[PDB]
Every structure is written in C-alpha cells, then in structure tokens.
Design a protein around this ligand. Sequence first.
Ligand SMILES: Cc1cc2nc3c(=O)[nH]c(=O)nc-3n(C[C@H](O)[C@H](O)[C@H](O)COP(=O)(O)OP(=O)(O)OC[C@H]3O[C@@H](n4cnc5c(N)ncnc54)[C@H](O)[C@@H]3O)c2cc1C
Ligand SMILES: Cc1cc2nc3c(=O)[nH]c(=O)nc-3n(C[C@H](O)[C@H](O)[C@H](O)COP(=O)(O)OP(=O)(O)OC[C@H]3O[C@@H](n4cnc5c(N)ncnc54)[C@H](O)[C@@H]3O)c2cc1C
Ligand SMILES: CCn1c(NC(C)=O)nc2ccccc21
Lengths: 588, 588
Amino acid sequence: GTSQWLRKTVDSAAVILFSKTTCPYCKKVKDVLAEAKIKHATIELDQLSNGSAIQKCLASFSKIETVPQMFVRGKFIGDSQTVLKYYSNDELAGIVNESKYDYDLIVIGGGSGGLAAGKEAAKYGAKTAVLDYVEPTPIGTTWGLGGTCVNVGCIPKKLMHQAGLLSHALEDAEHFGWSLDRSKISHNWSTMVEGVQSHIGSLNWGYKVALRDNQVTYLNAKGRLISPHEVQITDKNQKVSTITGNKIILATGERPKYPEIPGAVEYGITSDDLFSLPYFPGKTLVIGASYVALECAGFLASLGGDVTVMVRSILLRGFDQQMAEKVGDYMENHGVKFAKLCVPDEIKQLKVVDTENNKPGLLLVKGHYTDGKKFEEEFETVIFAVGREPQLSKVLCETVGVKLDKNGRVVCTDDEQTTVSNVYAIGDINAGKPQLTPVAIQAGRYLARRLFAGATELTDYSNVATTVFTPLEYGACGLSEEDAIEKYGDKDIEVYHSNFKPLEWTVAHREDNVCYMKLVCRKSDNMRVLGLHVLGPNAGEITQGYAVAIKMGATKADFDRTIGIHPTCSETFTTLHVTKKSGVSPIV
Amino acid sequence: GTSQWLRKTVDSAAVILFSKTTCPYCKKVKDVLAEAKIKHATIELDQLSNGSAIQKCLASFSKIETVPQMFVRGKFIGDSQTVLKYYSNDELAGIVNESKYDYDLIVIGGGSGGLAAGKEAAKYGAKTAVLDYVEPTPIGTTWGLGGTCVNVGCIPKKLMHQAGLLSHALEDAEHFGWSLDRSKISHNWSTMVEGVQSHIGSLNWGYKVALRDNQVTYLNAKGRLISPHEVQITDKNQKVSTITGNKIILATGERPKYPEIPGAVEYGITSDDLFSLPYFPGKTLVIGASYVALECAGFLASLGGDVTVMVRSILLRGFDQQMAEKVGDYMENHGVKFAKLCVPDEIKQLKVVDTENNKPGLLLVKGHYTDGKKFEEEFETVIFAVGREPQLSKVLCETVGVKLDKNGRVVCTDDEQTTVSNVYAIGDINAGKPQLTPVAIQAGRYLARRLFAGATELTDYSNVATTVFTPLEYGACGLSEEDAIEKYGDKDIEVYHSNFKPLEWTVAHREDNVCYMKLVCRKSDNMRVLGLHVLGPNAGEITQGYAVAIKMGATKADFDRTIGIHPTCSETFTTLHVTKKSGVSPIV
Ligand SMILES: Cc1cc2nc3c(=O)[nH]c(=O)nc-3n(C[C@H](O)[C@H](O)[C@H](O)COP(=O)(O)OP(=O)(O)OC[C@H]3O[C@@H](n4cnc5c(N)ncnc54)[C@H](O)[C@@H]3O)c2cc1C
Ligand SMILES: Cc1cc2nc3c(=O)[nH]c(=O)nc-3n(C[C@H](O)[C@H](O)[C@H](O)COP(=O)(O)OP(=O)(O)OC[C@H]3O[C@@H](n4cnc5c(N)ncnc54)[C@H](O)[C@@H]3O)c2cc1C
Ligand SMILES: CCn1c(NC(C)=O)nc2ccccc21
C-alpha cells in the first residue's frame, strides 16, 4: 500500500532526499546539495501523516531507518557521513550523473503541455530534453518555439479579436461625449500584424530563455520514438542521430485539416497562415463552423472585411445549440454573411497572389446546397476551418506498442500512461480530453511531479470551463441543456434564464435583449447546477469564477444566497428566477 | 415548533390560500380568485416536508382539517363551497378588502430597498403604499423616483467611469492598427451629461410604471412615522394628512455630509450635484478619500480635467491597505494629484457661478498640512466626499420608540425588526450592515416574503463582495489581509499573490507589473480562502463568480483543482503559487 508508493517513487525519481524539517544532519546535506548545483526532490517525513511507515519502509532499500537518506535513479547512495565523504573526495558529481540513459526525460513537442512538463521536471533534478519542430504549411509558413496557442492560436486570435472590439469602442465613444467621427477612420492590417508578431516573438525568446535558466536541453529537431527508450532525431541539416531517455512524454499537438477537393491545398489557407499574412485577406470565404471559423470570421468583419461563412449543417457542433444559434444571429446582424447547408466542390485560381505589390489573389469557389442548388462566387481569400488532427505516424513507430484510438489519438490511463509503461501522453493527442491550453499545462505539470517528486495528485478533466471569443463572447461551464435532458430526462431538469443589457450599452444605444444567460439544474439533486451559460461582453472573466463553485458542487440555493456586485453583468446570475417551464418571457 | 410558524403566517398574510397541487377543488378556487383579480399567497402542502402536520394544525383556526382553506388578514373565510357562495352573492370583494388599516404595508423611502420590498409585497396580495420625496441640495438640485444609486450613485458614476475608460481605448486603437490620432480628440461634458440624464429619466419613468402595474399606490410626499401604525405625509402643496398601515418599512437612506468650515455649504458641491452639473467643473479639488472621492477624481482626470485630491490620513479606510495604496499609486501616475496629510480650513468665493454663459465660478481654498505647513490654492469647483449620514429626526418621532445607535442608524434584529414590533428597517439605515444596493434589494425582497407569504429565509450579510471603480478597478470578497492577521495571528495566515498583465495591454505598450491579485488563507483550517483581492480591468466581472465559491467554503485546493479559461485575466487565480513568506518576487 504505502510500500508500493515508496517503491514507485524511489525508482523513477532522479535525485531525491528523504528528510525531516527538524533535523540538522538533514540540513547539512541540503546545504551540500548545492553548493554543488545539484537539484533534487525532497520529501519531509515529519510533514506526512504516515511518515512513520515510510521511514520503516525505506529500510527495505537502504538497510537503515534514519534520515537523511539520499537516492539517485533508484539506488541508495548513503546517509550524512557517506554523502560528505563523496563530497570532500570529489566523487559526488559523478555519482549524481550516473544513468543508463542520456536523459531522465525526453519531451516530444515544444508546445503548451510539453514546455510545462519539461520545466517542472527540471526543478527536481531530472536531466531533461525538449524537442520541437514546426513543419511548414503548404505555402511555407513557419514559426518559433511555444506551440499552436502561442504562435497560431489563442494568443494571436484574441489580440485580433481585441482589434475588432476596439471598433465599437470608437463608435461608443461619440455617444459618451468624445469628438471623434468613427466614419472617417479605417484599419491598417499590416500595422496590426506587425504588433501581434512582435509580441509573439517576445514569447518565442522568453521560452528559450526559460529552458536555458532551468538547465533543459532544447533541440530544434523532429523526434521519432523508435523503441520504448530510443528517440530518433533529424536536425536542421537533415543529420540523423539517436538519443535515449528513461521517461518519454508525447506532446506533439495537431494541425489543421483540408477537405479533399481540387484547389484546396494549392489556393486556400488555414489559420496557421492567417496570423502572419503579409496582406489583408480582402473579400474572404471561411469554410467551416467551429469556434476557430466563427472567431476568425468575426474579427475580420469587425476590421472592415466582406466575410462569408459556409456552413455544412450547424454552428458549434458539440456546444449548447440554443447558445450556438444566438452567437450566429448576432454575427449575422453585424455584417457576417452565411451560406447555410452548403459545402465546397472546387477552388479555381483567377489571379496569383501579388507578392510584389502585397495583395491577395482572386479565386472562384463552386459548391452546392443540400437541396442540390448550385453555389458559385468569387473571393480574394479562402480560409479552411474544417477541424484538426494529429499525425502520430510521423512521431511514433507502430512497433513500439503505443495503442491509438479510431481517430489516431493515444489511449491513456487516468495518469496519462500509454500502453507502454515508461511512455506518457498529454495535451491535444490525449484521446477523449478537452483540447485546451490550460488543460495541457496542468496535465504536464502534475505528471512531472508524479514522475520525479513522488506526488500523487491527478489532473481533473471534468467541468472545464470554455469561452468562444466571437464578436459577442460565449462562456460556458458544464453540460449543455440538451445533454442534461438526455441524461436525466426532461422532468428532472429545471432551467432558469434571463436576458440582460450591459450598463455600458445604454448610453451607446445598443440592443436591449440580445445578451442572455441560463442555469441548467437537476431538481432531484437539490437543484444542483449542471451547466452555466452566458452570452455577453467579457464572458470569459464572467465565467471563470463560477467554475470554482461548480467544481465544489454548487446548487441554485448557493447562487441565490450570494449577493451581487452592482453595476455588473455577472450579477444577473445571483437573482435568476424565471423558468422555461413557466413560459414567462425572459426579456427585462 | 411548526405550530407557531403557522400562527405567525396567518396573522400577517393579507390573502393566503392553503392548497394542494393534486386537488381540483383548489384549482376551482384559484381560478375564481384570478378572475376576480384578487392576488394572494399560496402554500402548497403536498410540496412541503411536514405538510401533513400543518394540515392538522390548520384546524386550530378553521375547525376543519381539509384543503383548501383561504384566510384574509388573519381571519378564516371558508372552504370551497363557502368561497363560491361569496362569489355568487358578490360578497367577496368586500371581504378580501376589509382591513383595520388603510394599507397592509407602508414603505417610507422610494429607493433601492424600498421599491424592491413594495413590489414583492404587492405580488402576494398586500395593499401597499410607497412614499418618496427628494429634499433638494443647498444649491437646489433635485431628481426623480428610484433612490441614490439610480439618480446620484452607482448608475451615473459607472456611466461616467465608462466615458473615462474610453479615452484609453482611443489611445489603444492606434497600436492595434486604427487610423485615428488621439492627440486631436477632446471631450464634451454637457454631451455626456445629456446622455446620462436621459437614461436616468427612463429609469424614473420605468419605476412609476412598475408601481402602477402592480397596483402599488405611489405618493410623492415626505413621510413621518408619528405612531407605530400612523404615518404623516406632506405633499407638494404642503398639505398634511395621515394614513395608516399594518406593517411599516423604513428605507430612507442617507445624504452627503459637509465639513463644519466657512464657505463649504455656500460654495462647494457634493456627488448629489455632480451627476447633473450643467457646466464642466474645470480645475477641481476633491476633499475626502473614500471610494466616492477616488471614483469621481478618477474619471474627471480621464476626461481631461485638472484634478487634485486632499487626503486627511489614508486612502480607502476600512479596505485592505496594500490594495488601497496600489490603487492610489496608479491614479497618481495617470494624472491625479494628491495633497497628502492635509485638511481644509475655509472656502472663499472669488467669482460667482456664471449661470447664464454656463461656466463655473472661482474659489480660493485655504487649509493646512499635518506638520503645520499651510495650503492655499484656487479651483473652479470644490467637491466634498467626507461621508454620508442618515437623519431620522426628519423621518421618525422619538416618542414612537425606535432605538437608534450612536451614529443615528436603526438597531435591528437579524430579520430586520426594530424595537417596535410592526416596524422594520432596510438598506443604508440598518445599523452595522453593508451599505450596498444589491444588499438593500435582497433584504427588502426577503422581508416581503416573510411578512406576506410565510417565508422563513433570512438575508445573509457576510462575505459580500465589492468593487471600487477607480481608473484601475479593485474588486474584493472577504477579509482584508491585516484583518485576517489580527483575528488569527500572523503564523496561521498564508498569502498567495502574483502580478499580471492583461493580454490586451501587450500590443498597447501598457505597464508590465501593475495589475495584482492575492488570496489570503488560514493554514489551520485547510487553507480556507479568507479573502480575495484583485486590481485590474473588469474587476467586478472577475470577482463576482468567486463570491459563490467563497460563500461555499472554498479552500486553496478548490482553486488549484479548477482549470483556467485562456486567455483571461481571471485565470491567474487558478495557478497561484508564490507565497509572501517565501520572499520570492511576484513580478511576471
Ligand atoms: C485558432 C486556434 C485558437 C485557439 N484558441 C484557444 C483559446 O482561446 N483557448 C484555449 O484554451 N485553447 C485554444 N486553442 C487550442 C490550443 O492551442 C491547444 O489546445 C493547445 O495548444 C494544445 O497544446 P499541445 O501542447 O497539446 O500542442 P501544441 O501547442 O500544438 O504543441 C505541439 C508542438 O509539437 C510540435 N511537433 C509536432 N510534431 C513534432 C515532432 N515529431 N517532433 C518535435 N516537435 C513536434 C508542433 O509543431 C508544436 O510546436 C486554439 C487553437 C487554435 C487552432
Ligand atoms: C456616489 C455613490 C456611488 C455609489 N456607487 C455604488 C456602487 O457602485 N455599488 C453599490 O452597490 N452601491 C453604491 N452606492 C451605494 C448605494 O447607492 C446605496 O447603498 C443604496 O442606494 C442604498 O439604498 P436605500 O434604499 O437604502 O436608500 P436610497 O437609495 O438612498 O433611497 C432612499 C430614498 O428615500 C427618500 N427619502 C428620504 N427621506 C424620506 C422621507 N422622509 N419620506 C420619503 N422619502 C424619503 C430619499 O430621498 C431616497 O429617494 C453608491 C453611493 C453613492 C453616494
Ligand atoms: C414638504 C415637502 N414638499 C415640498 N416642500 C417645499 C418646496 O417647501 N416640495 C415637495 C415636492 C414634492 C413632495 C413633497 C414636497
């Protein structure tokens, strides 16, 4: 029980000291380590409730029962007298660098999860390597260390979203007394891209600095796991070599899909290319209906573009569909055109991209609606947002034994372990997990602590909150209304809802009953809050706090007894009273 | 136990039906009442814990044990046959309307708490009157129905705060690619005031419409309680009269104080006048250091004014003083000037207000610093924010016997009852309670349900969250750090903190290490979160959701195991890890 924990901790930890806070012999060892720049984990037996058992169980390893005890990669090294003997005899550094492997830990992938896992393992003395490589897009776009979010995801798209929100700030400003005239002001795309790319470049640099200051080896190379302990690397010069590591963490992420139609790869782009595009896209078609598709179409329209979205069936598949529809109704009322129930058949090139004068090309798009009618239109840019996928047959030889699911994602235990006992997987390629940056970071850090510091805490993947950053934002935590009804039945579900109007919108003459929120509850479990949903400004800031209360099991009575902050949008959640079953209107 | 709840409910409700959902004899009675336009409360016994004991207990009043039973103002009226006998003989209106008093409920004070209590009472059948009168300021300012928040408080000051935030939006837009030159844009005070006052006027009108559509008598008159059940009223022609009511609720609020010095009343103004001032203030001095003073000084500086604040001792007395100092340092770095440890001695008039050409006067302010050094400077406008007080001598005859404290506030039990048994107090005049608008609204709604619908729920006044809307906003829920250290001792307190930078501030070249947040936790109680503090944009939307978690007993591990929403400011709370005791820097 406890004995199985100590055996697992001693075997994978790299350098670990078993100690007591009260002991001066322990402190003198801590002082020698280091002094010699030796990083190590530390376990304070007098802090754990069953420290007395662990102390006794240590003897099965060292034949002794006192503290301090210092281990290196599963082997007992000695007590106080024995460590100092190794110190003053110049023997200690060679002991702590003894390893059957090149590294204690190899991370494949330099993104949100990989960077987090690597930095955390180094903090407990694990000798660590982080591999990262960015395969170019079809037109050759490439970027720096840090992953999809930092370079071509959350970070550049929220910045561009903010550029879009600022257009309504300029409008709202006249109503509040500022002299400017919004209709005489325009937007410069390349100025915005330059500022976004400057910030991304400082994140690239900061990560290389952080790996250096933690003694992590960074290799800009493509990794391939060929046996449980061997990683084959190909570098910037196509030179090939093999390195070994004790533990492996796969964290390679995904890349955008293209539909299998003529002209797609040749003449269109994806979001990988959009955030550093040297020219404004101009008249744009977005193909898809994911949050990537709706967020990108949304800010392009706000920046003055002529934007159309082509929707195969529904918006935001997998999210609450009433919320999805309200999100789309708002974008359509503020400029974004929709071609509903429609798929593309081919893209035809009329103008090549004008790389000299810095202008987009011109394309002809042909498709069809679900009733057979035809679609034909010209656009300057075609953006595909039709999902994302890993390509683990490029990271992972089939002979190693890592089981994959139907979609090509790694099947893992609830401690991130794959079917091969020393190989783990985190982030987007972990099958069945929410694909989100804060999830990948938490999974990476907690895994690093279990591998190298004897921690036990697991990552909790339930009820992770989300926010879709459309022109009007949409934040959520928990089940959709239709999922709650499907799971418990309509008679056990109660939904409280209300419209609302931000106070900032009054003087600026904006819509009265467009913002909206609801709580979906379970009658038979004390009116437990099963899902929360809000459409409105700053929806992410609104939603985050409530996710702690949902984690804790919050009910409708808990919301009722909490008092609101006034004047805020978020306070509407503390006074909700109209139910859907009542049939009373939710307008205010 | 159950006995005396039923007694209290029946003696107090105006029209109450004890019913069952399954019974069609009640459904026949309910429809008779809806058709006759008789509002009433309804106690469904088949949906209560011990509904079978009340059924028995009801016979102490009716001599029958069956359902339905209908009561009017304490008196049993009949079963299903006896009520339809009154409906067929058309004796029913006269019975439901007969009362010992003119009204079941008189509300003195038509503001946040008073309007809320009156409307909720009228739902359940109570014959309700709501009195409101706005005594003019010394220079004669006056406004309409709705109270301090609506007319001269939360609503107009956050609207003016938003006009100030938009100035930095115009600045930020350049860096995001928009083509405006912020240097060449100015602000028009009177344009702002017109927009703000038009919204307030639509809220005055909305309240009068709401009162009428609930059959609430609204009297624009000054009320004085002369006896426990008698209220003397004086209308706009100084016509005196007397009405009577069963229950009385006092909700008359407070007004600003003036310091006892020459010139202040004559030549200065307060917040009561600021929000409808017809001229721009020009060069302004604010005297005080509360949230009113800092909030007003904040947006006046952002609108281009020349603003000085005169501080006796400290900023934001009663709030966490590390947070208060960070607030004031931000204001000082963005154009607010402070005269520290200084008080005023007199205000001298140099120019009279040019009420024709719409211009302020000119004033000479004389005062001294705390060491003894003298202060003397000219300003166009002087605003006093040195606190607010009630004046119940205007409202309340000392012979009625309602106990006040040494401040003049009403001493109440935990269910809002005064020392006279039919008289209650709510809102700012309730002694020791937080003086906030959502608190008044909840207090008054919950009391109305206890008086007239047999509810038992009390208002919870603990851990109510706040937000100070200074140029950088400051939200808080729970104890300040000094208050926790004092109550539990410095060794039982751990504090997690961190600076942060909003993503939106990166491209706009704003400051790196100014926003800040902290969790104040108790070690010996599972690291319970005693207080949450955040300085940054949108701080009210950030804090609100966490108030629910804090109401539920959240610990640091509850925050840890919740996943962030990326990219937001609020997510920084889910990964805090630097303690104050460790001495590591909180910078980014
Ligand atoms: C447009 C867009 C917007 C998004 N917005 C948000 C948002 O607002 N919030 C949010 O939470 N999530 C958002 N996401 C999702 C978020 O980016 C991902 O969930 C997250 O980045 C996944 O992290 P990861 O570590 O699993 O993979 P990644 O961050 O993709 O890192 C994997 C890295 O490994 C590299 N690599 C691949 N193969 C190899 C190899 N063989 N050898 C070496 N290196 C290799 C890849 O090139 C990449 O650099 C967005 C995604 C997109 C596309
Ligand atoms: C500048 C300022 C800013 C504020 N900002 C906020 C904020 O952002 N958030 C927040 O939560 N709170 C804020 N407050 C506090 C909030 O306004 C009060 O807590 C709230 O208005 C209290 O409501 P009330 O019903 O107790 O009294 P009031 O709202 O003051 O209503 C009492 C009413 O009764 C009238 N009256 C008085 N005497 C009589 C009489 N004899 N007969 C008839 N009528 C009478 C008064 O004129 C008034 O209309 C602010 C206050 C100020 C001054
Ligand atoms: C006694 C108070 N009374 C006065 N009195 C004056 C102007 O002396 N003006 C009023 C206006 C509305 C309601 C009541 C009013």
